[PDB]
Design a protein around this ligand. Structure first.
Ligand code: OU2
Length: 341
């Protein structure tokens, strides 16, 4: 067990191994309780996140367990990964705090679109990397569900990672119509809707669908993609939703080339395939990676899938001390990634 040292930072106590030096808070709460630090073992900058009240309730405890399980799973260049996880606790009985260590990223995509107006080449490479990470995530039966520009981070080399910072940019702006009202008929392609929204915004400099609420959001979406026809209406189970959609005056599908005027036609074609209202018909991440828009980047021998992920815990209803002990197990069994790079 290494030697820890203690300090106070913006109201909070931090107790971390000596290996991590010069802790300085970043992001002013946007990222949670996170410090940049220098990792003396690799000579690299890292991010250290201290979980906030990880075991305060059954719900926090489960969320803590879930976050650690997800992070320990992710081994891919376009998804955030776990460099280390530690607690100052010597036993299960005194286990109360959880620290997670990851690579430190340079900037989020929200801040980047807000600053700059990106080239078609940069949009190609950024959306390619998102999709490549999504192929991976989705292969493990994991759905992100909250993809938006502030959950994507890039380094100066334009290398991108998918993250989730959890609770400026409204989630609802990027959320798929089928999970706007109810959560009944949805698949991994909710994430592909989000990618379409993100890609639109990178291309134009403008939130594609800036709805004020769930109802407005849906109205903005239908104005672009058109009100559902007979076929898709047949698959809506919710009376109130179908009533709502059918109570609107009909709107035709827009021609996306008339909306994203001057964009690469291949970008426009992919957008048409991502922003389809029928989630059974929306392009998957794997299919999208083969789209001609990514011809410069796509290599089918280097778009890996994930190992299987045991999500059976999600259906369980356990006590706080049980979720805590499971989380402890996961801290203890953590094997760090190989150093070398
Ligand atoms: C709701 C809580 N979510 C989670 O459970 C997920 C679990 C893993 C997900 C990964 C993506 C797929 C879905 C699972 N958890 C994390 O993603 C997750 C966990 C821990 C960390 C810690 N790292 C940072 O905070 C960090 C790194 N770079 N920068 C940086 C700096 C400047 C500018 C821009 C960025 C940060 N601020 C980072 C993400």
């Amino acid at each position: 067990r290494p030697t820890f040292y203690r300090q106070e930072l913006n109201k909070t106590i931090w107790e971390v191994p000596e290996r991590y030096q010069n802790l300085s808070p970043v992001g002013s709460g946007a990222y949670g309780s996170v410090c940049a630090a220098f990792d003396t073992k690799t000579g690299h900058r890292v991010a250290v996140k201290k979980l906030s009240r990880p075991f305060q309730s059954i719900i926090h405890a489960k969320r803590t367990y879930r976050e650690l399980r997800l992070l320990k799973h992710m081994k891919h260049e376009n998804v955030i990964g776990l460099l280390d996880v530690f607690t100052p606790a010597r036993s299960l009985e005194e286990f109360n705090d959880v620290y997670l260590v990851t690579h430190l990223m340079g900037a989020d995509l929200n801040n980047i679109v807000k600053c700059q107006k990106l080239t078609d080449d940069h949009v190609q490479f950024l959306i390619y990397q998102i999709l490549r990470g999504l192929k991976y995530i989705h292969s493990a039966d994991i759905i992100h569900r909250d993809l938006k520009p502030s959950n994507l981070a890039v380094n100066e080399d334009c290398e991108l990672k998918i993250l989730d910072f959890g609770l400026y940019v409204a989630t609802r702006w990027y959320r798929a119509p089928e999970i706007m009202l109810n959560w009944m008929h949805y698949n991994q392609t909710v994430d592909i809707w989000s990618v379409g929204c993100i890609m639109a915004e990178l291309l134009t400099g403008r939130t594609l669908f800036p709805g004020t609420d769930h109802i407005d959001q849906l109205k903005l979406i239908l104005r672009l993609v058109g009100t559902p026809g007979a076929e898709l209406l047949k698959k809506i189970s919710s009376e109130s939703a179908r009533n709502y959609i059918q109570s609107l005056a009909q709107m035709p599908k827009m021609n996306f080339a008339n909306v994203f005027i001057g964009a690469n036609p291949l970008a426009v074609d992919l957008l048409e395939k991502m922003l389809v209202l029928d989630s059974d018909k929306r392009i998957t991440a794997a299919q999208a990676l083969a789209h001609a828009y990514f011809a410069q980047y796509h290599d089918p021998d280097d778009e890996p899938v994930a190992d299987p992920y045991d999500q059976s815990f999600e259906s369980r209803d356990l006590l706080i001390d049980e979720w805590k002990s499971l989380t402890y197990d996961e801290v203890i069994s953590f094997v760090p990634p190989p150093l070398d790079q």
